[PDB]
Design a protein around this ligand. Sequence first.
Ligand code: HEM
Ligand code: HEM
Lengths: 361, 362
Amino acid sequence: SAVPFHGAHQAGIATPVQDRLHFAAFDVTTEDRAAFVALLKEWTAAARRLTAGHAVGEGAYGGLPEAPPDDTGEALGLKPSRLTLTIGFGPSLFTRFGLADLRPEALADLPKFPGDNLDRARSGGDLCVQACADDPQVAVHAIRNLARIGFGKVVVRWSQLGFGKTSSTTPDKQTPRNLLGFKDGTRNIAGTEKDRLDRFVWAAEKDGTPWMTGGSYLVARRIRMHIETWDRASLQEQEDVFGRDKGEGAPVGKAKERDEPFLKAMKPDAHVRLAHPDSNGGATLLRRGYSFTDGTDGLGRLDAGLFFLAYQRDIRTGFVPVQRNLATDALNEYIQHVGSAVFAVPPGVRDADDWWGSTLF
Amino acid sequence: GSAVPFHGAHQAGIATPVQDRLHFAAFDVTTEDRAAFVALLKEWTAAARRLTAGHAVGEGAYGGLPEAPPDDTGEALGLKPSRLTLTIGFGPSLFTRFGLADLRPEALADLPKFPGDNLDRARSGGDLCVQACADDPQVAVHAIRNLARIGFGKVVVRWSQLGFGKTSSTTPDKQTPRNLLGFKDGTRNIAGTEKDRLDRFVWAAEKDGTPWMTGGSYLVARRIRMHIETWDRASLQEQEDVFGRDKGEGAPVGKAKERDEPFLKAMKPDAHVRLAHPDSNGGATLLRRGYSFTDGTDGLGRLDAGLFFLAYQRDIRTGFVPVQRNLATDALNEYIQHVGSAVFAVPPGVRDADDWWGSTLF
Ligand code: HEM
Ligand code: HEM
């Protein structure tokens, strides 16, 4: 029901994937390094409370009547719900507080990719907080209260709600389906594979940025799906686009979802074939994204898609090569990248005295 | 994860226990062929029978002809019914069509303008609506998506609203949820077991003068923005004065327990509960069934939160209108703004496998 907050790594990367997501990007408004360090310590104290299911500060009620309550109160009577709070620092943060020479080389700017249609306002950000939990209100309350605590030093730049499976009704190692109706996550780095996480996910001391040892690098892409066009495509077009069948999720020619794929039996521009590590020099990613549906746009169409989150040991050898290989993906006909951001996710909060960002500041 | 029965004298999704998620869509009709519209209603009813049972619409989500698109879009495959209910309603603008003018019920009243109204005409009105409620948001989305897909060429989605968590209760034996202002919402509502109060305050009767609406109800939807920056800097005493209940327990001011009966004279004259209470409105009672929403930021560095307010009643003129008129002096008005609005006539239930949505009207 809870997930430990302290560790060598931040939680919410290799830890079990929770049902809901509230992702927020923040911009920093203060120039004062001391004030910003004060805020990181305040935020860490609040995150310790929130992840244990407690209110922030001195609570949501029962304080001085003439003061505003420390906690906004909308999670009172809810459970921790496996809440994890993961912080990351964007490249623009390092233009402040004199940190320019501390930006990791692995925190690379993404190239412009064919077909990008990025909304500037839903892109970038000086920092992020990824809030995952099984209850969406627990996640929202966390973001709402961190934003309130930081008011005057940070503002919210953009915010995204997402959902995965619903655990109260769905088995745990049954693969979720994305909004195109296909199982999503079959060949992924699992949190149980410690050695694959060391090789592909966690930054190492010898990688070149000591303060990032134990951290990771995060790519966020807001990917709209053209739902109504996808839904008019034949069953065979849909399966050809991925290289797996829709019902079982088996690679073409195989019989079970987890059968290892034979890439030559797939069409040359099938998504699985272009994404597979064998097609990308061994490049492998930890995907931890969530579906979204925000409503409908001005033309009656469903504003829905995949809020893609990938964690990797180096942006230049993870996301960049694989996304480059998707230049000709048959899936490109039905999707559009409309928001993008990169963040360096620092190492974990080691104990009760530690704080978010201690190794950098 | 169980299923809620689709057939009844009444539509599910009203007195039913309030499910965790909402996907609400309003549609405009784009055909003049009444026969075509009736056929759509029968097809939509057939699909709802499958969807509310956890089955794929039509001939399933795969295994049909390779060269044809699948009947069901497939993203609910392997999911339980998750208490999905589908509730259809007819907007006033619908009755200008198919020669239905003389059949518009008196109780489907247009709302007057209220002080502070800032209504977005794009996210208001609508020829008809479908309320999809479930405990799994994927289940609810899949139902709206497939209904719209089936109605391509005859209806188009006008606007939709997703509610990520409920702010209402029809089951007073369970915990009352909190809205984004941090107060319990739903304590003094009408419970799905109070058969007498539902007949008296929610369901339309034959006598009421519109025979095809017997067993139906009338829905008011109001999209309400919350000024959370303003609210979050108010003192605790300020927040509690605004409502008339304390924040921690949610009890009426001066009393100990959430469910103790309010004593209205102990509340400020402009307290929300005081002005909304039936006793202050000649007995007017509503069934509240709303949900919270957040739709990103406001572009000004803040979260964009609010409440999608839904009320069911036997007659809009004796339910929502008198109570909302009494809210003109509400202390809560300082922290909220109504930015969308729509009313619908909710027809009676689909009586059996041979019945269909709107059959008593068509
Ligand atoms: C809306 C956008 C996308 C959708 C719907 C989608 C869907 C899928 C599906 C259904 C699979 C097969 C099941 C699985 O192994 O997970 C898959 C595999 C994969 N996808 Fe995507 N994907 C999307 C975008 C991306 C992007 C942007 C990347 C990387 C830049 C990516 C990288 C991968 C990888 C690495 C695999 C595993 C391939 C393997 O090793 O077998 N996907 N994707
Ligand atoms: C964001 C907007 C609103 C919020 C946050 C809100 C909040 C609340 C709260 C906290 C309660 C006390 C607990 C309860 O009995 O449910 C309450 C009661 C009530 N509210 Fe509201 N409300 C809102 C809008 C409305 C509107 C628009 C109406 C009617 C037009 C309404 C009608 C009522 C009624 C009838 C009660 C029950 C009073 C009683 O009989 O004791 N509310 N509301």
